[PDB]
Amino acid sequence: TNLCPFGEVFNATRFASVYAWNRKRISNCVADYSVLYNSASFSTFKCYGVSPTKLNDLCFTNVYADSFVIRGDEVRQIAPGQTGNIADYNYKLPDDFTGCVIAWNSNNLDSKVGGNYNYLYRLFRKSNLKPFERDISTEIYQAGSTPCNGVKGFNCYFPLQSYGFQPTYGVGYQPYRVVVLSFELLHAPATVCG
């Protein structure tokens, strides 16, 4: 019985930007969520359709591990039924989401003096994302009636903005690493247990 490779996902040295969020398929293995839930490091640990403490008792067919960085005050948008810049344009959970949302402050790793500009998010889009849809396009967003022709200006915005994380930011603006675990139960052997 091989252990769940949660280390590659939670302990990845770098995380994706939320607009290009990473997905890892987790199956085979059999790891325990008690230590994760009893960990003093995760500031958010919220589950839907399933109980975190009783996770060791349950078996599922597949697990998806999505990971990315957002700012602290956006963690509340990583939940079913939310709207806002992140839920609308970057990473959208379904209403019937079954899984857990885990986040922790990553200021020590992801902020730099003068700003870490590596992490981006999408501010504009012609429509809201469908659940688990991904958009990595970079066309100038034409908000107004003037064509942009690839240049910013009159109501013409580059769609991605850098978080520019600085260590002196308040915790609402500090970077948080997020792991979304989707517990899928289809018609297959339940190979992932606690």
Epitope: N149, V151, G153, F158, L160
Partner: antibody, heavy 125, light 111 residues
């Protein structure tokens, strides 16, 4: 190859109007922004503005908005920079340049890949 | 915060390596890539580096650019006499809604 050819040197007095030109060759003139850059003698480069000849849209630097007019005539592949009333302080070298735009790794790209040979403007009373 | 600051001058002997800094802010380099232009005396500027570190055809690999956050740098390895020129960094700036050129650096190949 892609080429920009500008008009000849200009000697003017303050108060006269002036229109200098920049003709493009070897590319689709209506598919690229073309812009103007000022270089006063001994000094650095200053971006003035751009026009998209496909639809005549313009973007002007705030330092040059309303001081000059940029235009284009796509039937003859030519862009223009115009003053209604020159000052001595308009004395400078002026370049036109073709813009290239896009994005790399989520960050905005804008650069000037083909340059005209420059037009000297000398204004004195 | 909308000026790209460059050292006024730089110099080296032939074969040496010279580096030219380009200092910006969140409104330009933070969300936009940097470019470099080379102007030999009496000539028009030419594109030297685009999008932080790409070289057009006809620019040798002795020129390399780099960008980290709000800072950028041009390195010239194995200085040759024809490299004596003014160098300008540049990027789009979102406060002004337009491209801005750096203040320029004069490079001398010590003869």
């Amino acid at each position: 190859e892609v080429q920009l050819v500008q008009s000849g040197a200009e000697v003017k007095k303050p108060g006269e109007s002036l229109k200098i030109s920049c003709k493009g060759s070897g590319y689709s003139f209506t598919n690229y922004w073309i812009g103007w850059v000022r270089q006063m003698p001994g000094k650095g480069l200053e971006w003035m503005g751009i026009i998209y000849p496909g639809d005549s849209g313009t973007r002007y630097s705030p330092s040059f908005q309303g001081q000059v007019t940029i235009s284009a005539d796509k039937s003859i592949r030519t862009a223009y920079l115009q003053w209604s009333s020159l000052k001595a302080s308009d004395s400078a070298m002026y370049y036109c340049a073709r813009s290239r735009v896009g994005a790399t790794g989520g960050y905005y790209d804008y650069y000037m890949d083909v340059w005209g040979q420059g037009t000297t403007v000398t204004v004195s009373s | 915060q909308s000026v790209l600051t460059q050292p006024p001058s730089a110099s080296g002997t032939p074969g040496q390596r010279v580096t030219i800094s380009c200092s910006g802010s969140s409104s330009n380099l933070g969300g936009n890539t940097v470019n470099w232009y080379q102007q030999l005396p009496g000539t028009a500027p030419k594109l030297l580096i685009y999008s932080n570190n790409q070289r057009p055809s006809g620019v040798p690999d002795r020129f390399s650019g780099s960008k980290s956050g709000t800072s950028a740098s041009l390195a010239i390895s194995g200085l040759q006499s024809e490299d004596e020129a003014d160098y300008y960094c540049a990027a789009w700036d979102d406060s002004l809604n337009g491209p801005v050129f750096g203040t320029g650096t004069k490079v001398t190949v010590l003869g």
